[PDB]
Structure 1
Amino acid sequence: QRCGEQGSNMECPNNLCCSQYGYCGMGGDYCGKGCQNGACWTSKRCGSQAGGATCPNNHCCSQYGHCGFGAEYCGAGCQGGPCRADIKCGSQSGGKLCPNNLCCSQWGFCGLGSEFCGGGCQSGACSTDKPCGKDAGGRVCTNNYCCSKWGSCGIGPGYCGAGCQSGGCDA
């Protein structure tokens, strides 16, 4: 029920702005000064201009390193987000990972949905759920996902907790 730093980087639905207090709404109280994620009045910075920083709420990072939607942000020069041009990844691009957990299709493009995440999926949010760890000739998860006690890739206490064979383990 909280957003931003008070809600573990949780984002509000329908681009609602997270105020400086960790609450979701609309108006100057949420979108103005201290706005956390969502349609903030003062767009957040990203890409090149702000250390590789990704846009929250899947916003496109325009060529000037600002976050938003529309031609100016998703069009030409777009550096991150659901940019209007296909984004390349995988073996075909020196094993690049897609940003924001997106799937890298068998063809080397970033997306979400069956075509990217289903069979052939290279990295990211693949729905193929391939075996990792010792029961898997010690193969490791992509994206530094945790390889659970069970030989499954994921993120969460169950995956990164006790019995984590490799990846971004807590334990």
Structure 2
Amino acid sequence: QRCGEQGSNMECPNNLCCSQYGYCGMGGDYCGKGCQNGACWTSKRCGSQAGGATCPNNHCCSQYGHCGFGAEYCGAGCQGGPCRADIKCGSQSGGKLCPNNLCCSQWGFCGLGSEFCGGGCQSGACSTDKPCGKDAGGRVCTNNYCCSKWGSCGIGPGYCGAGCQSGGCDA
């Protein structure tokens, strides 16, 4: 029920802005000053300009390092987000990871969907669910995903907790 720092970095649907208090809506109250994510009046900073900073809600990082949508943002020089130019990764880009957990197709492009996440998927939210750890010739997950006691890659208490064999293990 809450967004931002109070909702553990949860985002409002349909780009509703998250007020300074951690609640979702539209208007000056939510989108003006203190806005956390969503359609904030003062676009957030991102990319190079703001330290490698990614945009929330999948917004595009424009060449000037401001968050938004449209040609000025997803167009020429976009630094991140669903850019208009195919985003490269994988073995064919010296292991680069796609941002925001997007899957890296077999061919070295960042995206989401069966074609990217499906078989051959190199990194990101692959849906191939390949086994990691001891029971897997001790192979490690990508993106620093935790390798659960079960020999599964993921993020969550169940994966990263007790008997987490590798990855961003809390335990």
Q: Is this a same-fold pair by TM over 0.5?
A: yes
User: Secondary structure in 2 aligned to 1:7?
Assistant: coil
The 2-side partners of 1:83 and 1:111 are apart by 10
Tell me the residue number matched to 1:99: 99
User: Secondary structure in 2 aligned to 1:21?
Assistant: coil
Q: CA offset at residue 33 of structure 1?
A: 0.2
Tell me the residue number matched to 2:165: 165
Deviations 1:82-126 (A, max 9, x none): 000000000000000000000000000000000000000000000
Q: CA offset at residue 130 of structure 1?
A: 0.3
The 2-side partners of 1:36 and 1:122 are apart by 32
Aligned residue pairs: how many?
A: 171
Q: CA offset at residue 165 of structure 1?
A: 0.3
The 2-side partners of 1:154 and 1:140 are apart by 12
Q: CA offset at residue 34 of structure 1?
A: 0.2
Q: CA offset at residue 40 of structure 1?
A: 0.1
Stretches of structure 2 lacking an aligned partner (at least 5 in a row): none
Deviations 1:44-69 (A, max 9, x none): 00000000000000000000000000
Q: CA offset at residue 73 of structure 1?
A: 0.2
Tell me the residue number matched to 1:72: 72
The 1-side partners of 2:164 and 2:56 are apart by 29
**TM-score, normalized by length of structure 2?**
1.00
The 2-side partners of 1:50 and 1:27 are apart by 26
The 1-side partners of 2:169 and 2:4 are apart by 24
Q: CA offset at residue 5 of structure 1?
A: 0.1
Stretches of structure 1 lacking an aligned partner (at least 5 in a row): none
TM superposition outliers: structure 1 runs of 4+ over 3 Å: none
Two-structure CA RMSD over aligned residues (Å): 0.2
Deviations 1:13-46 (A, max 9, x none): 0000000000000000000000000000000000
Deviations 1:137-164 (A, max 9, x none): 0000000000000000000000000000
The 1-side partners of 2:163 and 2:141 are apart by 15
Q: CA offset at residue 132 of structure 1?
A: 0.2
The 1-side partners of 2:168 and 2:52 are apart by 20
Question: What percentage of residue pairs aligned between the two structures are identical?
Answer: 100
User: Secondary structure in 2 aligned to 1:6?
Assistant: coil
Query: Superposition pairs for residues 17-96 of structure 1, below 5 Å?
Result: 17-96=17-96
The 2-side partners of 1:118 and 1:54 are apart by 25
